[PDB]
RNA sequence: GUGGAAGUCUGUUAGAGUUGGUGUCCUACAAUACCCUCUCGUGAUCUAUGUGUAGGGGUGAAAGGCCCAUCGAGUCCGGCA
RNA sequence: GUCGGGUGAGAACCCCGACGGCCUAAUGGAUAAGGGUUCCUCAGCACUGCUGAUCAGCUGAGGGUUAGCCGGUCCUAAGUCAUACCGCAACUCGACUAUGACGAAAUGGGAAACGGGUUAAUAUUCCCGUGCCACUAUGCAGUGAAAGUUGACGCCCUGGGGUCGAUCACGCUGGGCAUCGCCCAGUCGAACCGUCCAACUCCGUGGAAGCCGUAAUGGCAGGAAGCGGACGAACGGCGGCAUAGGGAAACGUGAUUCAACCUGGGGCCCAUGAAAAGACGAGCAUAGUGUCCGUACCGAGAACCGACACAGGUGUCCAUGGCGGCGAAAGCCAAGGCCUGUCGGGAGCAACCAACGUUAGGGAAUUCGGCAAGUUAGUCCCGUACCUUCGGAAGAAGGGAUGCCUGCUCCGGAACGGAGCAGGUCGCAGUGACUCGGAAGCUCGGACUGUCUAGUAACAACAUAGGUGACCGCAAAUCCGCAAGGACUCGUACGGUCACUGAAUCCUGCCCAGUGCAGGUAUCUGAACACCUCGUACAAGAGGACGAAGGACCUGUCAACGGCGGGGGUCUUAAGGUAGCGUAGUACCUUGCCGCAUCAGUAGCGGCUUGCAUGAAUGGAUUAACCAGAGCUUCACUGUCCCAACGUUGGGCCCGGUGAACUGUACAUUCCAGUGCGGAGUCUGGAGACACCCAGGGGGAAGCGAAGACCCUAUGGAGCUUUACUGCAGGCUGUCGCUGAGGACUCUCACUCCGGGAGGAGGACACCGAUAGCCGGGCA
RNA sequence: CGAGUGGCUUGCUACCUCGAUGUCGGUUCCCUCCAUCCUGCCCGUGCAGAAGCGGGCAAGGGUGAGGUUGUUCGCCUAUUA
RNA sequence: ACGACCGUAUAGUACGAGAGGAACUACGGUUGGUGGCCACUGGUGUACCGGUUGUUCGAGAGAGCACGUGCCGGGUAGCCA
């Protein structure tokens, strides 16, 4: 996590980096199939190693709160 | 690094060269303009009244 | 004195220019004759240097390959539509008139056919509120109620890359890398830290502006610095 | 255990720099040099060439720093005896 | 460097040999820029050369650079120019938009050449051998031909293939050494043509419900392993090339580790890592053509820049030569280069200075200050505190070990890889040289890495992430231009402009009176044009009515400028200092008082604190980590000191040669007093004084160097400031023109904007020209 | 209260010097003065002695080491004739 | 070119109720200063002898280099305190 930051930057800065990146690297359920094989490819870019579905999502999460709103309405 | 002698050693760039139009080594090969006769800048020949005393 | 930095900017010299020769494309909506008989398929997702957000390359029926301002949730293979009769789904573009009220949209045109001006940044979106035969009311990301020509085109959904702002840069070097992809001079030297000759706030034994910071709207360039025509300052009251 | 992150550590690797000696030199080897010590050395890094910004104007992580040994307004000639 | 010798009229430094040395990312090899003949030969020494010179980068005279396949040439990059269009009083000026061209010689892209031989000097260019590319022609073949592929790409970790090199084993050829049997060198051979293919991808078979696989991640009923197959790599292997070439000869064979080169797997991005020409796609024979430009040499302690044959500066590649060791480290040594970081001779060679070695006992007493020097040191084992943001602190601290020889064990395929064991044994000392941290505590500052005064400042200053406020919906805010136009912007509020504070943590009180900004405003004030009155046969002019912004007035606002006192148990002028911190890098008084520590402490630390004159983003407090930042203490150590000594190298001194500069009104062997514009070698009185020369450390010549920088003066200069004087840009606002029809309104036709277009939006407004009022250190 | 000497403190003046006479403290090295701190020799005492206290002659010699502070000065410590 | 001090004998005496406590003189030493000298002790001693690390000369022997001794031990003359 923020362990690469050593004793620098302070709690908050490297607390959020840890969480954000912790959620960022979790296995994500592919919208195409259903497997938890989605990985980030770059800023806002995600892909499933299983079915190869490459799509857009949040910067650090494949789905954002606002993104999930569109579906509804 | 001093602005004097040590900095003079870095000077190996060619800028002013013999001019096709006037013959003076004033044709800036990077600007493609002669600082002496104006070649590359103007069809007319570079001239100024301040090149001599005002009443002469 | 000497011209302040804000004045050097205007001359548009390299130091202040954006690395345009490195930019990809201006994600403007496609121009359709009518009918809406224009559809294409997402062929790839790319990074947009100018916006730090993803963009989707779309191949249209008539053979036109162009990058598009992608909303969140668009993936390869997906099929998008652009026209009056386009289906009401994420990633599709059509005039506000056809868009059902209460639907989040992005890359909204200011004047019908301009290509899109509003809500283009990461994870943002305008909210189409009121419909009509004369004016479509949209609520822009800043919270402002905007009256637009119902003929103004827009893309359904919110812009991809949301949350980009939630993570701190942490170090100067990261800011550095981002700044190198924009038309900006960075880092920032405070005005109070300069000599009097260089800024209205320069000079003085200790650092401090020797004047009130709220400057008038009518101030000439070179003097308009600090808090421009502020309606108020601070956090109190 | 594996893995190998880092404006991460040591390092006269290349390369960059310069804390102290208030050493040597001070009609110098040199109009900014020499020696030892010292600091940086995967990055906001260093470096070559090309290219752009011009004088009340540039350029400046700001020292009134830098813009060809000169800058709190370059240089040249002219105004000018 | 030295001894011999060669040449020459002449030899320390020109050449030969021997002996002795120096250089190893360079003092060697190839080159870019730049220089321009400095290159080679012959003949010379007046000039140039830190002395000499027969020498030379010098002088005289000749000579030398050979290309289809190495660059250029071709392509396009940031970007530049030209033409057209537009602006400008105008242009050699100026932004945009079209078109065209220009823009890369080591080091972007790119059709094709290798090996050897030859010259005094060129050489993938000439010559020999072999090969290749493009175009064109002829011929055979071919109807395919443009889709796609390539050119073509970031950073970090890593597997696999694999050549050179290096090393190990054994053989062959030659050399060296001479108690041994060791040691050294060589053992060769290209482009190209042909062939082989690992990885990746995919297909067939198969049928895993837990197996397959990796260094690691991972893979699978959407079909794992296994089996077969398609496509498919090297500057690599293999065969030809080659009774080519090269070698005196032999003219090897295997292996390990493997730069180059080839091919994969993984990870990172608020960062996304060129383009175009060209090539492939798309056969073969034979013939012809392949022009133009560059080509020498230096590439640096003498060929470049720095006035110089300057200790400076100056790009690339040789990053795999041996021992060493972690190593592209040190040290030593090859290949190769050099004795030109170019004056020599002499004196146990004194004083004195530079750089350095060794110092008994004491051990920081030295000093502003351990400045300088020293101490420690590599690797392994044991062990490691406070504090902490849980990362770190940490190599904390402290303790022990370390060589050689003999025989072995373990890990691994193995290394000429690594980890251990047993016995033997030497020294004062086993990281034996070299390389190689001294350690600990308290306080102040800035959080951190980073930046800076080229040439006296590296810091606490600037930056920074983080915090905050301000402006703006894009026909925007901010900014450049006289204009035509332009940056921001292939950007759109999760944006970007303008400012302040400066990581995290706990927090950030009161004040809107003044000033600033903004909003509002009945009434008041408020310009010009038009309008009305008076005046004028007209006009000047006087007055009136109307009244925009602005001001008066009201309100909002301090993470806006800033403020938070005196007095009494309110007063100025709004409030009257809250949390904290406190004698501070802020406290004059002041060495404040108490304590700690010391023999003794204007220091330092802790506490107190009425604070001359602390205090909350003019941020307060606090703080782990970090630091060539400031201060203090301790352990260790030492020539810093007591107190100096001896030694080493280069100078100094004497000799040959070469050979400056600073400075100079004159006189001048001075000393003690006095005098004098009061700070005299020169005046007065005395005293002393034979001339000249060598070495010395510098008392005096108010020594030399610079028309004092300090201070004042000048109706001197410049940079900077502002509610100084006066103006000028700029913004806001009214009015007139553009400008049309029917104190409030509709319309469309100018004009503006959007749209490829139709058309849509807006609209007599806005933009623009003119003028008037307000603001106006942005500027003069 | 009165009279003086010095030129160590400070003040005053503006005589010399602005085409420059480089600051304080320290250090090192040399000479000097006496208004004597010690040492020699004396006089007095509220001088038994020992020792103090005061005075006279006298400048031959000596007057040292350390803690804070740049400090001079001074405060402090152990030695000392 | 010598200044000064401590100690012993004088003497637990003179003096004094006691407490305390001298001197002349003769001696021994210390300190500061001064001039000189090296038998003694100490330092140095890149004369010299030895040990030993890395590397090169094939090993051995014997040597070079590692800065004017690679490092370490001893140390004659001489110079010194
Ligand atoms: Cl940003
Ligand atoms: Cl070439
Ligand atoms: Cl792999
Ligand atoms: K003066
Ligand atoms: Mg776009
Ligand atoms: Mg940039
Ligand atoms: Mg800043
Ligand atoms: Mg400043
Ligand atoms: Mg200013
Ligand atoms: Mg500040
Ligand atoms: Mg450059
Ligand atoms: Mg040659
Ligand atoms: Mg030389
Ligand atoms: Mg000693
Ligand atoms: Mg002292
Ligand atoms: Mg030191
Ligand atoms: Mg084994
Ligand atoms: Mg302090
Ligand atoms: Mg810092
Ligand atoms: Mg400087
Ligand atoms: Mg520094
Ligand atoms: Mg900030
Ligand atoms: Mg911010
Ligand atoms: Mg700061
Ligand atoms: Mg204190
Ligand atoms: Mg406040
Ligand atoms: Mg401030
Ligand atoms: Mg003067
Ligand atoms: Mg002055
Ligand atoms: Mg002036
Ligand atoms: Mg337009
Ligand atoms: Mg002014
Ligand atoms: Mg005077
Ligand atoms: Mg003088
Ligand atoms: Mg007397
Ligand atoms: Mg008595
Ligand atoms: Mg005397
Ligand atoms: Na782990
Ligand atoms: Na230095
Ligand atoms: Na100027
Ligand atoms: Na091959
Ligand atoms: Na090696
Ligand atoms: Na010579
Ligand atoms: Na660093
Ligand atoms: Na106020
Ligand atoms: Na305050
Ligand atoms: Na630092
Ligand atoms: Na010494
Ligand atoms: Na003198
Ligand atoms: Na000035
Ligand atoms: Na005396
Ligand atoms: Na003292
Ligand atoms: Sr230099
Ligand atoms: Sr250069
Ligand atoms: Sr031109
Ligand atoms: Sr002219
Ligand atoms: Sr656009
Ligand atoms: Sr467009
Ligand atoms: Sr200021
Ligand atoms: Sr408040
Ligand atoms: Sr680092
Ligand atoms: Sr380092
Ligand atoms: Sr210094
Ligand atoms: Sr030194
Ligand atoms: Sr100097
Ligand atoms: Sr590394
Ligand atoms: Sr300069
Ligand atoms: Sr003149
Ligand atoms: Sr001659
Ligand atoms: Sr020559
Ligand atoms: Sr070209
Ligand atoms: Sr090239
Ligand atoms: Sr790289
Ligand atoms: Sr390998
Ligand atoms: Sr050549
Ligand atoms: Sr070279
Ligand atoms: Sr050089
Ligand atoms: Sr050699
Ligand atoms: Sr010579
Ligand atoms: Sr010795
Ligand atoms: Sr000390
Ligand atoms: Sr001391
Ligand atoms: Sr230890
Ligand atoms: Sr610098
Ligand atoms: Sr410095
Ligand atoms: Sr903070
Ligand atoms: Sr106010
Ligand atoms: Sr208080
Ligand atoms: Sr702070
Ligand atoms: Sr006389
Ligand atoms: Sr002298
Ligand atoms: Sr003078
Ligand atoms: Sr007297
Ligand atoms: Sr006495
Ligand atoms: Sr004084
Ligand atoms: Sr004092
Ligand atoms: Sr006695
Ligand atoms: Sr008694
Ligand atoms: Sr030696
Ligand atoms: Sr050692």
JSON list of N, CA and C in Angstrom, two decimals, chain A residues 27-56:
[
{"chain": "A", "resi": 27, "resn": "UNK", "atom": "N", "xyz": [-10.74, -7.47, -6.88]},
{"chain": "A", "resi": 27, "resn": "UNK", "atom": "CA", "xyz": [-11.27, -8.15, -8.05]},
{"chain": "A", "resi": 27, "resn": "UNK", "atom": "C", "xyz": [-12.63, -7.53, -8.31]},
{"chain": "A", "resi": 28, "resn": "UNK", "atom": "N", "xyz": [-12.87, -7.12, -9.55]},
{"chain": "A", "resi": 28, "resn": "UNK", "atom": "CA", "xyz": [-14.13, -6.48, -9.89]},
{"chain": "A", "resi": 28, "resn": "UNK", "atom": "C", "xyz": [-14.98, -7.34, -10.80]},
{"chain": "A", "resi": 29, "resn": "UNK", "atom": "N", "xyz": [-16.28, -7.33, -10.56]},
{"chain": "A", "resi": 29, "resn": "UNK", "atom": "CA", "xyz": [-17.23, -8.11, -11.35]},
{"chain": "A", "resi": 29, "resn": "UNK", "atom": "C", "xyz": [-17.41, -7.51, -12.75]},
{"chain": "A", "resi": 30, "resn": "UNK", "atom": "N", "xyz": [-17.00, -8.26, -13.76]},
{"chain": "A", "resi": 30, "resn": "UNK", "atom": "CA", "xyz": [-17.12, -7.79, -15.13]},
{"chain": "A", "resi": 30, "resn": "UNK", "atom": "C", "xyz": [-18.56, -7.57, -15.57]},
{"chain": "A", "resi": 31, "resn": "UNK", "atom": "N", "xyz": [-18.85, -6.41, -16.17]},
{"chain": "A", "resi": 31, "resn": "UNK", "atom": "CA", "xyz": [-20.21, -6.10, -16.63]},
{"chain": "A", "resi": 31, "resn": "UNK", "atom": "C", "xyz": [-20.61, -7.02, -17.79]},
{"chain": "A", "resi": 32, "resn": "UNK", "atom": "N", "xyz": [-19.62, -7.40, -18.59]},
{"chain": "A", "resi": 32, "resn": "UNK", "atom": "CA", "xyz": [-19.86, -8.28, -19.72]},
{"chain": "A", "resi": 32, "resn": "UNK", "atom": "C", "xyz": [-20.26, -9.65, -19.19]},
{"chain": "A", "resi": 33, "resn": "UNK", "atom": "N", "xyz": [-19.29, -10.42, -18.69]},
{"chain": "A", "resi": 33, "resn": "UNK", "atom": "CA", "xyz": [-19.59, -11.72, -18.12]},
{"chain": "A", "resi": 33, "resn": "UNK", "atom": "C", "xyz": [-19.96, -11.44, -16.66]},
{"chain": "A", "resi": 34, "resn": "UNK", "atom": "N", "xyz": [-19.51, -12.26, -15.73]},
{"chain": "A", "resi": 34, "resn": "UNK", "atom": "CA", "xyz": [-19.84, -12.00, -14.34]},
{"chain": "A", "resi": 34, "resn": "UNK", "atom": "C", "xyz": [-18.66, -12.22, -13.42]},
{"chain": "A", "resi": 35, "resn": "UNK", "atom": "N", "xyz": [-17.57, -12.70, -14.01]},
{"chain": "A", "resi": 35, "resn": "UNK", "atom": "CA", "xyz": [-16.35, -12.98, -13.28]},
{"chain": "A", "resi": 35, "resn": "UNK", "atom": "C", "xyz": [-15.70, -11.76, -12.61]},
{"chain": "A", "resi": 36, "resn": "UNK", "atom": "N", "xyz": [-14.92, -12.02, -11.56]},
{"chain": "A", "resi": 36, "resn": "UNK", "atom": "CA", "xyz": [-14.21, -10.96, -10.85]},
{"chain": "A", "resi": 36, "resn": "UNK", "atom": "C", "xyz": [-12.80, -10.94, -11.42]},
{"chain": "A", "resi": 37, "resn": "UNK", "atom": "N", "xyz": [-12.68, -10.56, -12.68]},
{"chain": "A", "resi": 37, "resn": "UNK", "atom": "CA", "xyz": [-11.38, -10.52, -13.32]},
{"chain": "A", "resi": 37, "resn": "UNK", "atom": "C", "xyz": [-11.04, -9.18, -13.96]},
{"chain": "A", "resi": 38, "resn": "UNK", "atom": "N", "xyz": [-11.74, -8.13, -13.56]},
{"chain": "A", "resi": 38, "resn": "UNK", "atom": "CA", "xyz": [-11.47, -6.81, -14.12]},
{"chain": "A", "resi": 38, "resn": "UNK", "atom": "C", "xyz": [-10.30, -6.13, -13.43]},
{"chain": "A", "resi": 39, "resn": "UNK", "atom": "N", "xyz": [-9.37, -5.62, -14.25]},
{"chain": "A", "resi": 39, "resn": "UNK", "atom": "CA", "xyz": [-8.20, -4.92, -13.75]},
{"chain": "A", "resi": 39, "resn": "UNK", "atom": "C", "xyz": [-8.09, -3.59, -14.48]},
{"chain": "A", "resi": 40, "resn": "UNK", "atom": "N", "xyz": [-7.54, -2.60, -13.79]},
{"chain": "A", "resi": 40, "resn": "UNK", "atom": "CA", "xyz": [-7.35, -1.29, -14.37]},
{"chain": "A", "resi": 40, "resn": "UNK", "atom": "C", "xyz": [-6.22, -1.36, -15.40]},
{"chain": "A", "resi": 41, "resn": "UNK", "atom": "N", "xyz": [-6.38, -0.66, -16.52]},
{"chain": "A", "resi": 41, "resn": "UNK", "atom": "CA", "xyz": [-5.34, -0.66, -17.55]},
{"chain": "A", "resi": 41, "resn": "UNK", "atom": "C", "xyz": [-4.65, 0.69, -17.57]},
{"chain": "A", "resi": 42, "resn": "UNK", "atom": "N", "xyz": [-5.34, 1.69, -17.05]},
{"chain": "A", "resi": 42, "resn": "UNK", "atom": "CA", "xyz": [-4.80, 3.04, -17.00]},
{"chain": "A", "resi": 42, "resn": "UNK", "atom": "C", "xyz": [-5.88, 3.90, -16.38]},
{"chain": "A", "resi": 43, "resn": "UNK", "atom": "N", "xyz": [-5.70, 5.21, -16.44]},
{"chain": "A", "resi": 43, "resn": "UNK", "atom": "CA", "xyz": [-6.68, 6.12, -15.86]},
{"chain": "A", "resi": 43, "resn": "UNK", "atom": "C", "xyz": [-8.07, 5.96, -16.46]},
{"chain": "A", "resi": 44, "resn": "UNK", "atom": "N", "xyz": [-9.00, 5.47, -15.64]},
{"chain": "A", "resi": 44, "resn": "UNK", "atom": "CA", "xyz": [-10.37, 5.27, -16.07]},
{"chain": "A", "resi": 44, "resn": "UNK", "atom": "C", "xyz": [-10.60, 4.16, -17.09]},
{"chain": "A", "resi": 45, "resn": "UNK", "atom": "N", "xyz": [-9.60, 3.31, -17.29]},
{"chain": "A", "resi": 45, "resn": "UNK", "atom": "CA", "xyz": [-9.73, 2.22, -18.26]},
{"chain": "A", "resi": 45, "resn": "UNK", "atom": "C", "xyz": [-9.64, 0.85, -17.61]},
{"chain": "A", "resi": 46, "resn": "UNK", "atom": "N", "xyz": [-10.68, 0.04, -17.81]},
{"chain": "A", "resi": 46, "resn": "UNK", "atom": "CA", "xyz": [-10.72, -1.29, -17.23]},
{"chain": "A", "resi": 46, "resn": "UNK", "atom": "C", "xyz": [-10.88, -2.42, -18.24]},
{"chain": "A", "resi": 47, "resn": "UNK", "atom": "N", "xyz": [-10.35, -3.59, -17.89]},
{"chain": "A", "resi": 47, "resn": "UNK", "atom": "CA", "xyz": [-10.46, -4.75, -18.76]},
{"chain": "A", "resi": 47, "resn": "UNK", "atom": "C", "xyz": [-10.54, -6.07, -17.99]},
{"chain": "A", "resi": 48, "resn": "UNK", "atom": "N", "xyz": [-11.30, -7.02, -18.54]},
{"chain": "A", "resi": 48, "resn": "UNK", "atom": "CA", "xyz": [-11.48, -8.34, -17.92]},
{"chain": "A", "resi": 48, "resn": "UNK", "atom": "C", "xyz": [-10.49, -9.31, -18.55]},
{"chain": "A", "resi": 49, "resn": "UNK", "atom": "N", "xyz": [-9.66, -9.94, -17.72]},
{"chain": "A", "resi": 49, "resn": "UNK", "atom": "CA", "xyz": [-8.67, -10.88, -18.23]},
{"chain": "A", "resi": 49, "resn": "UNK", "atom": "C", "xyz": [-9.33, -12.15, -18.73]},
{"chain": "A", "resi": 50, "resn": "UNK", "atom": "N", "xyz": [-10.59, -12.35, -18.34]},
{"chain": "A", "resi": 50, "resn": "UNK", "atom": "CA", "xyz": [-11.32, -13.54, -18.75]},
{"chain": "A", "resi": 50, "resn": "UNK", "atom": "C", "xyz": [-11.88, -13.39, -20.16]},
{"chain": "A", "resi": 51, "resn": "UNK", "atom": "N", "xyz": [-12.87, -12.52, -20.33]},
{"chain": "A", "resi": 51, "resn": "UNK", "atom": "CA", "xyz": [-13.50, -12.34, -21.64]},
{"chain": "A", "resi": 51, "resn": "UNK", "atom": "C", "xyz": [-12.90, -11.22, -22.49]},
{"chain": "A", "resi": 52, "resn": "UNK", "atom": "N", "xyz": [-11.93, -10.49, -21.94]},
{"chain": "A", "resi": 52, "resn": "UNK", "atom": "CA", "xyz": [-11.26, -9.39, -22.63]},
{"chain": "A", "resi": 52, "resn": "UNK", "atom": "C", "xyz": [-12.06, -8.10, -22.80]},
{"chain": "A", "resi": 53, "resn": "UNK", "atom": "N", "xyz": [-13.21, -8.01, -22.15]},
{"chain": "A", "resi": 53, "resn": "UNK", "atom": "CA", "xyz": [-14.04, -6.81, -22.26]},
{"chain": "A", "resi": 53, "resn": "UNK", "atom": "C", "xyz": [-13.30, -5.59, -21.71]},
{"chain": "A", "resi": 54, "resn": "UNK", "atom": "N", "xyz": [-13.05, -4.62, -22.60]},
{"chain": "A", "resi": 54, "resn": "UNK", "atom": "CA", "xyz": [-12.34, -3.39, -22.25]},
{"chain": "A", "resi": 54, "resn": "UNK", "atom": "C", "xyz": [-13.36, -2.25, -22.22]},
{"chain": "A", "resi": 55, "resn": "UNK", "atom": "N", "xyz": [-13.47, -1.58, -21.08]},
{"chain": "A", "resi": 55, "resn": "UNK", "atom": "CA", "xyz": [-14.46, -0.51, -20.95]},
{"chain": "A", "resi": 55, "resn": "UNK", "atom": "C", "xyz": [-14.02, 0.67, -20.07]},
{"chain": "A", "resi": 56, "resn": "UNK", "atom": "N", "xyz": [-14.85, 1.71, -20.05]},
{"chain": "A", "resi": 56, "resn": "UNK", "atom": "CA", "xyz": [-14.57, 2.91, -19.26]},
{"chain": "A", "resi": 56, "resn": "UNK", "atom": "C", "xyz": [-15.30, 2.86, -17.93]}
]
